[PDB]
Enzyme design. Structure first.
Site, PDB file in Angstrom:
ATOM      1  N   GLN A  21      21.490   7.041  -8.825  1.00  0.00           N
ATOM      2  CA  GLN A  21      20.424   6.433  -8.353  1.00  0.00           C
ATOM      3  C   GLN A  21      19.098   7.394  -7.944  1.00  0.00           C
ATOM      4  O   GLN A  21      17.998   7.220  -8.354  1.00  0.00           O
ATOM      5  CB  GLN A  21      20.627   5.326  -7.141  1.00  0.00           C
ATOM      6  N   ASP A  38      17.862   8.922 -11.122  1.00  0.00           N
ATOM      7  CA  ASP A  38      17.209   7.988 -11.774  1.00  0.00           C
ATOM      8  C   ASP A  38      15.784   7.800 -11.174  1.00  0.00           C
ATOM      9  O   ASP A  38      14.945   7.717 -11.952  1.00  0.00           O
ATOM     10  CB  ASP A  38      17.746   6.531 -11.608  1.00  0.00           C
ATOM     11  N   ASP A  90      14.254   9.764  -9.466  1.00  0.00           N
ATOM     12  CA  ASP A  90      13.322  10.700  -9.720  1.00  0.00           C
ATOM     13  C   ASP A  90      12.745  10.715 -11.222  1.00  0.00           C
ATOM     14  O   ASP A  90      11.743  11.454 -11.390  1.00  0.00           O
ATOM     15  CB  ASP A  90      14.254  12.176  -9.793  1.00  0.00           C
ATOM     16  N   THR A 123       6.921  11.073 -12.200  1.00  0.00           N
ATOM     17  CA  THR A 123       6.906  12.176 -13.121  1.00  0.00           C
ATOM     18  C   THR A 123       8.383  12.208 -13.962  1.00  0.00           C
ATOM     19  O   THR A 123       9.478  11.978 -13.163  1.00  0.00           O
ATOM     20  CB  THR A 123       6.860  13.631 -12.258  1.00  0.00           C
ATOM     21  N   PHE A 155      10.125  14.766 -14.956  1.00  0.00           N
ATOM     22  CA  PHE A 155      11.051  15.933 -14.855  1.00  0.00           C
ATOM     23  C   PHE A 155      11.824  15.355 -13.666  1.00  0.00           C
ATOM     24  O   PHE A 155      11.628  14.839 -12.707  1.00  0.00           O
ATOM     25  CB  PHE A 155      10.032  17.049 -14.826  1.00  0.00           C
ATOM     26  N   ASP A 159      12.188  16.626 -10.584  1.00  0.00           N
ATOM     27  CA  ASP A 159      11.413  17.498  -9.653  1.00  0.00           C
ATOM     28  C   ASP A 159      11.087  17.006  -8.426  1.00  0.00           C
ATOM     29  O   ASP A 159      10.492  17.699  -7.632  1.00  0.00           O
ATOM     30  CB  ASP A 159       9.865  17.604 -10.417  1.00  0.00           C
ATOM     31  N   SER A 161      10.461  14.061  -7.330  1.00  0.00           N
ATOM     32  CA  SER A 161       9.530  13.264  -7.126  1.00  0.00           C
ATOM     33  C   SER A 161       9.611  12.305  -5.953  1.00  0.00           C
ATOM     34  O   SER A 161       8.904  12.122  -5.239  1.00  0.00           O
ATOM     35  CB  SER A 161       9.180  12.170  -8.463  1.00  0.00           C
ATOM     36  N   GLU A 197      15.588   0.428  -0.500  1.00  0.00           N
ATOM     37  CA  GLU A 197      16.505  -0.554  -0.982  1.00  0.00           C
ATOM     38  C   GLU A 197      17.796  -1.037  -0.544  1.00  0.00           C
ATOM     39  O   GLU A 197      18.130  -2.043  -0.778  1.00  0.00           O
ATOM     40  CB  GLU A 197      16.153  -0.579  -2.430  1.00  0.00           C
ATOM     41  N   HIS A 250      24.565  -0.107 -12.269  1.00  0.00           N
ATOM     42  CA  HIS A 250      24.685  -1.420 -11.346  1.00  0.00           C
ATOM     43  C   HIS A 250      26.107  -1.882 -11.628  1.00  0.00           C
ATOM     44  O   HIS A 250      26.676  -2.954 -10.663  1.00  0.00           O
ATOM     45  CB  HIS A 250      23.893  -2.511 -11.973  1.00  0.00           C
TER      46      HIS A 250
END
Ligand code: HEM
Ligand SMILES: *[C@@H]1O[C@H](CO)[C@@H](O[C@@H]2O[C@H](CO)[C@@H](O[C@@H]3O[C@H](CO)[C@@H](O)[C@H](O)[C@@H]3O)[C@H](O)[C@H]2NC(C)=O)[C@H](O)[C@H]1NC(C)=O
Ligand SMILES: *[C@@H]1O[C@H](CO)[C@@H](O[C@@H]2O[C@H](CO)[C@@H](O)[C@H](O)[C@H]2NC(C)=O)[C@H](O)[C@H]1NC(C)=O
Ligand SMILES: *[C@@H]1O[C@H](CO)[C@@H](O[C@@H]2O[C@H](CO)[C@@H](O)[C@H](O)[C@H]2NC(C)=O)[C@H](O)[C@H]1NC(C)=O
Ligand SMILES: *[C@@H]1O[C@H](CO)[C@@H](O[C@@H]2O[C@H](CO)[C@@H](O)[C@H](O)[C@H]2NC(C)=O)[C@H](O)[C@H]1NC(C)=O
Ligand SMILES: [Ca+2]
Length: 595
Positions: A105, A108, A110, A184, A186, A188, A190, A258, A351
């Site tokens: 997750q 993902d 990211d 993004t 990549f 990285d 995010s 979440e 999932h």
């Protein structure tokens, strides 16, 4: 054929040619084509869109019309009849920890996010979808079939809003709908730093020049920190227990809250920044505040890229790793680094790896108190169970010690996900993730199971037995084309997840392919990948190799017994060892005494 990709994003971003740092938007990674890989733009299309009206309308929108001569089956029914299962007993993956699920997750989140369409606030369209279950506009709802027990309890539909599209957010017709990406492409980090320059400067402590990530002022975890609270009301986290009103966490990504555990590994990532940035003034005090934040950011991105590719991908892809992720051979300015649409559905394979319960362990890896083992459904947007119920040490401990769900054909997605999902906008714990996934395919693209079997150059079936020998299940083959009626119309998510697993992995022939390709592209196309010459000094890399998740927790928690391999199923006390025997991150090469 091009129009020519359209798009309004961060209206103004121009490059620095000679600075060693990624942007927050993800612009200027590629010199030639500066937007490629950026944020708030169209997801990539490896294959042409497949719509009803040919451009925007999802298959199964109007009643009279058919995909390939047949009425496409309702999402919730496909769910009701193939996906769910009653008996939880004996699904747990015997060689994979909860961390295996949980890092799936992180990576993902990211890489992709297609934000749902709220052209709605102070609004009746939210109401017209919720109350009256009236399809149209951006409300494309999930109906209940005959004899669904949600009917007696909830209504006729599960509201479902269409995901965002480009070149304009308002009603429009032209081209073929491509769905947006707010993050993004990549690896990285995010999700820790943000993807909007505006949001990125708010998560920071510009109060003090140590280049630190802004932390919580009001809640504490044995001296160790928490992310800040998103103090905008209403709050999905405050809703599920109002007596303690504890809002969600603020992070580089919307979805940080979440789930309990997602917020946990997310609080390990935040704490790691402030530890590195602290450590990095210790060595080079001559540095200003931004060179602190930026250097610590670069090394944290390095962290996530190394773990993802060295420890996670080989236990997910397996025998198909070498096929799709060949060893590294520099950088390619000609490769598309972007997340393709299908990927945002292929990577949802996780999932089926989420187990029914989340448990909470004490300092001897023994159950932590009276209510140790909590149902996962009481955990969506639950921040009170961590500020108020013991911190993150009892949750990091469960991650290392407890198994995740093994994907099973007879047991696909837990009822805690498939029947009792909490959705942020709404009030009920009763949406369906499996059903919400299937509409979401039809909303986005999204070429059937066979189009994508062909993409990878695999047998595209045709017949009840042409599927039998592909999924190695006679009952599942029946069930699948009893509803879809031709192998062609099977939505990827289910069609892909229905296959048996490739040797020493967790996904199958098709999914190994779709997943493998993307992960190779995002590595080969990222100019700031940790192994490309130029971004890290040759010494720095050798220290970066010594890192592990096992350490991510030894430097940022009070857990002192950990596994040496945190991604595979191992037991306390035996397989667990002291933090001392775990390799540390040597930050010495990052010192640059001025004269
Ligand atoms: C209890 C655990 C989890 C919950 C409750 C959860 C919840 C959700 C929800 C509500 C959505 C929205 C679907 C949509 O409207 O498009 C979503 C999407 C998604 N989930 Fe999860 N999730 C969980 C764990 C995971 C894991 C472990 C993975 C992968 C290993 C994963 C991968 C994804 C991806 C890729 C998306 C689409 C995001 C995008 O736009 O790129 N999720 N999740
Ligand atoms: C931005 O960074 C500053 C500086 O690091 C943060 O303030 C510092 O916070 C620490 C821990 O929160 C404080 O330390 C201790 O405070 C307690 C109670 O307040 C007291 O018992 C001790 O005397 C000890 O000093 C400290 O006051 C403070 N340090 C300084 C120099 O101000 C600030 O919280 C950060 N802002 C954000 C949004 O993260
Ligand atoms: C449990 O899974 C682990 C990881 O998938 C298996 O160990 C790997 O074995 C392969 C085969 O040579 C190597 O590429 C690695 O050296 C191992 N992985 C790691 C992370 O070290 C292990 O075989 C499985 N255990 C059992 C009992 O089947
Ligand atoms: C709402 O949250 C509070 C925590 O803020 C929970 O309160 C605990 O409840 C149990 C039994 O009711 C007590 O024995 C604990 O001492 C409580 N903790 C504190 C300090 O309040 C409460 O259970 C939650 N209620 C709901 C609505 O789920
Ligand atoms: C960068 O990687 C790409 C994609 O793997 C390579 O592109 C190939 O280039 C050859 C000849 O240059 C062409 O025949 C094909 O169009 C490409 N192959 C495929 C199947 O995509 C490219 O070789 C790499 N760039 C360099 C020069 O190293
Ligand atoms: Ca990213």
């Amino acid at each position: 054929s091009w129009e020519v990709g359209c798009g309004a994003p961060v209206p103004l971003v121009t490059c620095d040619e000679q600075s060693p740092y990624r942007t927050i938007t993800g612009d200027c990674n590629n010199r030639r084509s500066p937007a490629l890989g950026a944020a708030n733009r169209a997801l990539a299309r490896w294959l042409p869109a497949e719509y009803e009206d040919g451009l925007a309308v999802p298959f199964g929108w109007t009643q009279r019309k058919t995909r390939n001569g047949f009425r496409v089956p309702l999402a919730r029914e496909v769910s009701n009849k193939i996906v769910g299962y009653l008996d939880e007993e004996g699904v747990l993956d015997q060689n994979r920890s909860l961390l295996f699920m949980q890092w799936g997750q992180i990576v993902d989140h990211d890489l992709d996010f297609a934000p749902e369409t709220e052209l709605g606030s102070s609004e009746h369209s939210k109401v017209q979808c919720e109350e009256y279950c009236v399809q149209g506009d951006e409300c494309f709802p999930i109906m209940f079939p005959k004899n669904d027990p949600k009917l007696k309890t909830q209504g006729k539909c599960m509201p479902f809003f269409r995901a965002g599209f480009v070149c304009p957010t308002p009603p429009y017709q032209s081209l073929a709908r491509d769905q947006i990406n707010a993050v993004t492409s990549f690896l990285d980090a995010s999700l820790v730093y943000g993807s909007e320059p505006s949001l990125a400067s708010r998560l920071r402590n510009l109060s003090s020049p140590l280049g630190l990530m802004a932390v919580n002022q009001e809640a504490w975890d044995h001296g160790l920190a928490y992310p800040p609270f998103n103090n905008v009301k209403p709050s999905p986290c405050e809703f599920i227990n109002t007596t303690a009103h504890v809002p969600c966490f603020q992070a580089g990504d919307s979805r940080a809250s979440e789930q309990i555990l997602l917020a946990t590994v997310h609080t390990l990532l935040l704490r790691e920044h402030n530890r590195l940035a602290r450590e990095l003034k210790r060595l080079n005090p001559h540095w200003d505040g931004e060179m602190l934040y930026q250097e610590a950011r670069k090394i944290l991105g390095a962290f996530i890229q190394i773990i993802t590719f060295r420890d996670y991908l080989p236990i997910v892809l397996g025998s198909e790793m070498q096929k799709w992720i060949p060893p590294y051979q520099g950088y390619n300015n000609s490769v598309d680094p972007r997340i393709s649409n299908v990927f945002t559905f292929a990577f949802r394979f996780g999932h089926m790896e989420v187990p029914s319960t989340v448990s909470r362990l004490d300092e001897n890896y023994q159950p932590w108190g009276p209510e140790a083992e909590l149902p996962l459904h009481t955990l969506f947007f639950n921040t009170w169970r961590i500020i108020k119920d013991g911190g993150i040490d009892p949750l990091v401990r469960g991650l290392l010690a407890k198994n995740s769900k093994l994907m099973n054909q007879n047991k696909m997605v837990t009822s805690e996900l498939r029947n009792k999902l909490f959705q942020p906008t709404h009030k009920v714990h009763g949406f369906d993730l499996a059903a919400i996934n299937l509409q979401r395919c039809r909303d986005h693209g999204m070429p059937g199971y066979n189009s994508w079997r062909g993409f990878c150059g695999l047998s595209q079936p045709k017949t009840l037995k042409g599927l039998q020998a592909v999924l190695k299940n006679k009952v599942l083959a029946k069930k699948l084309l009893d509803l879809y009626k031709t192998p062609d119309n099977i939505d990827i998510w289910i069609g892909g997840n229905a296959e048996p697993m490739v040797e020493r992995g967790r996904v199958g022939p098709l999914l190994a392919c779709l997943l493998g390709r993307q992960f190779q592209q995002i590595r080969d196309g990222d100019r700031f990948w940790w192994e490309n010459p130029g971004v890290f000094t040759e010494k720095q890399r050798d220290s970066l190799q010594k890192v592990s998740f096992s350490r991510l927790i030894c430097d940022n928690t009070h857990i002192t017994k950990v596994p040496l391999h945190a991604f595979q199923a191992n037991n306390y006390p035996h397989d667990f060892v002291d933090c001392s025997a775990v390799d540390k991150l040597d930050l010495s090469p990052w010192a640059s005494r001025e004269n």
